[PDB]
């Protein structure tokens, strides 16, 4: 009642999209260090008993296709769903290797009414990406 039921046969999937190299038109330099993140996440979620699937350097079209396919799987025996996005970004946008795609397009596939086998189950999207170009100068404490 107060806590999500996490005793289904499987914790669920953990989809990791690791974009490191981009098309010059994006003006994004290689995301050095992202492989460390990808490996760290793989191990971390493996220990949490998630079925991890790592995908590297996906175009914006491939990201959409992957998400669509995953949302069409039968998640009935899974307690939750996790998707980790590692890439360049802008507010409300994540970058495929060849260009931007709205995050809303990606998450919509999992809406309570579009992915019935995940209805009532926690859907987590972990996003490592810029959301603009403002910097935080901080304040001394």
């Amino acid at each position: 009642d107060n806590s999500y039921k996490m005793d289904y046969p499987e914790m669920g999937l953990c989809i990791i999209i690791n974009n490191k190299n981009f098309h010059k038109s994006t003006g994004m330099t290689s995301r050095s260090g992202t492989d460390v993140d990808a490996a760290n996440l793989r191990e971390t979620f493996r220990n949490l008993k998630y079925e991890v699937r790592n995908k590297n350097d996906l175009t914006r079209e491939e990201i959409v296709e992957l998400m669509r396919d995953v949302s069409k799987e039968d998640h009935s025996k899974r307690s939750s769903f996790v998707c980790v996005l590692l890439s360049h970004g802008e507010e409300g946008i994540i970058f495929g290797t060849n260009g931007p795609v709205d995050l809303k397009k990606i998450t919509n596939f999992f809406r309570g009414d579009r992915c019935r086998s995940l209805t009532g189950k926690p859907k987590l999207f972990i996003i490592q990406a810029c959301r603009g170009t403002e910097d935080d100068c901080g304040i001394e404490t």
């Binding site: 309570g112 859907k123 490592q128």
Partner: protein
């Protein structure tokens, strides 16, 4: 008998709206480094929002950018937890 179609989503953003997110070429991104560390240390006990709150503190206090370009030097970062969750989330199960 019905729930919102937007319910039960949790968006753990590495940074606040409109801001840069930092990544170290050798150690990885500040956010993912911290997220994995807090999950490894607390997933067997704490509820997810509380783990993410510790991630916020770790990123906010232990990291500061270093750059030869003054424009990108001494910068800070705070992650952004966006929850439409309706229940507490634990990665453990009492049987």
């Amino acid at each position: 008998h019905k729930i919102p179609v937007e319910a039960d989503f949790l968006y753990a953003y590495s940074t606040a709206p409109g801001y840069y997110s930092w990544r170290n070429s050798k150690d990885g991104s500040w956010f993912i480094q911290s997220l994995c560390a807090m999950l490894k240390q607390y997933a067997d006990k704490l509820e997810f929002m509380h783990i993410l709150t510790r991630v916020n503190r770790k990123v906010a206090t232990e990291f500061e950018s270093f750059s030869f370009d003054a424009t990108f030097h001494a910068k800070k970062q705070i992650p952004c937890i966006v929850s439409m969750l309706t229940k507490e989330l634990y990665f453990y199960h009492h049987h």
